[PDB]
Amino acid sequence: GLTEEQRMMIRELMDAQMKTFDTTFSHFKNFRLPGVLSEAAKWSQVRKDLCSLKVSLQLRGEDGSVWNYKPPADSGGKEIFSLLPHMADMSTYMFKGIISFAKVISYFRDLPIEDQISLLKGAAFELCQLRFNTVFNAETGTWECGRLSYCLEDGFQQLLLEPMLKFHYMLKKLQLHEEEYVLMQAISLFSPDRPGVLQHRVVDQLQEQFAITLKSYIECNRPQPAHRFLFLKIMAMLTELRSINAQHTQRLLRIQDIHPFATPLMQELFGISLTERHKILHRLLQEGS
Amino acid sequence: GLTEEQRMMIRELMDAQMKTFDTTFSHFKNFRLPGVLSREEAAKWSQVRKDLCSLKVSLQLRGEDGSVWNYKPPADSGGKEIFSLLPHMADMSTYMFKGIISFAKVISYFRDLPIEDQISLLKGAAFELCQLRFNTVFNAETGTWECGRLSYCLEQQLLLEPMLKFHYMLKKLQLHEEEYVLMQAISLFSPDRPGVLQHRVVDQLQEQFAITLKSYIECNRPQPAHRFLFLKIMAMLTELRSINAQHTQRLLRIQDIHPFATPLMQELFGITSLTERHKILHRLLQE
């Protein structure tokens, strides 16, 4: 089986995940919502950007009532940004959970504060997408976030051309365990080649052991032939997630330049002496757990 | 055809309806919306829980950009969950009531009445005239009241509820605008409302409106197939009066345990000198 150090590593990651992933989104509050009764190549790029990831929004009340928001079609105007303030609040809530996740890991808190900042900058979106996938319903095409749900709107082959959507469907198909998800989070978090990382050697050694632990876990708990090459598939998915991260960052900067919507914590993570430019990140890392 | 006096009578009513009926609800704004996320008391809440379950409707908002917000009410599960839409309905009812007050105000036959009778008539008829106006935006094929960008959609079981049976039966008559506005006048000028002093004057005015409606139908729908349309209209008015009484007692029971009525609504339904007990109504009539 697994070595006792690998067992302890998985248990610490899983403990951290449980403590910092509010999978019922019960503490996501005070978010913005679309109002009730509401250069050319750059706009053309932005309009193609937003239409790819088009979702409707549903809020179930504690009483059993339901509010449902259907987004407008693109009529060439500011109507395509109606959901961005809400998405900024949701992404910000997710990022805070990801920050708390890293803070609980012993190997992360032992790193210098500037490397903690640079790793969180490099990995925050990726870790958020990994968590979002665990609440993704591939049959209904909806992310189920507690009383909130985000449903992709109607074909499906065309939708899969959007890399972010293809990633979520492909990753869901692997039917990963919680332990495999959290090891993916650690491999992405401890990436030695993120910009600004000074302790690249210690990070690379850490990433290698998380990858070794993931491979050993898969060999210990998945005898079926449906899971052949599963470790390599997961590592390829992580490489793909890194590519999607870069495309998404460019997409956000294009939208933010035309229609600013990013919260102050997002502006820090996307870059819109390391500690001076990241007062919020610095603060959250000092507050501890 | 109609006599010149009947022609002018219809003209004033249609002019009144045109000036005071916001048929696209373009000026209904700033309304409330349901939140985004003992011994005899138990018998009171028991009767009230049944009352709200008859007032079950879905709600839709169509924004200018093409976005749509939709609200589906909860199922009855105790608690104020069954009260979630009462603030919105209070705002819609109050907006509609104000239009009815403006409607009566421009009618010369109404202005000539004493202010106390004007108050008494509006109290007795306001709800009825609101339902008559609501019938003209009711879509019988979809069960939806289309109020501009707002829609109220329901969700033989419904035909048992008198309010819904009323709206389907009235819509099936396919009345003209002139016939709706004469319906409103006949209901507004009811001599048998509580507190009416000039009973004989109001009765004579109602009869003239009814004769005008009867003559309108003979002249403009002479085909023998509309031979009893006037009597059908009068029967719908009688049924609407019955629904008005049922709605009032239902509103008072809800108000008693969960206050929701606006100040103007409190005056119209008698919730705590006829003028001094209706200061808002009096003000709206004096402007």
Numbering used by the authors:
A (entry chain B): 142 to 179, 195 to 310, 314 to 431, 445 to 461
B (entry chain A): 142 to 178, 192 to 309, 316 to 432, 445 to 459
Q: Which sentences did the original study use to describe this structure?
A:
PXR is a nuclear receptor that can be activated by diverse compounds to elevate metabolism, negatively impacting drug efficacy and safety.
In all reported PXR LBD structures, there is no difference in α12 conformation regardless of the presence or absence of ligand; indeed, most NR structures display the same α12 conformation.
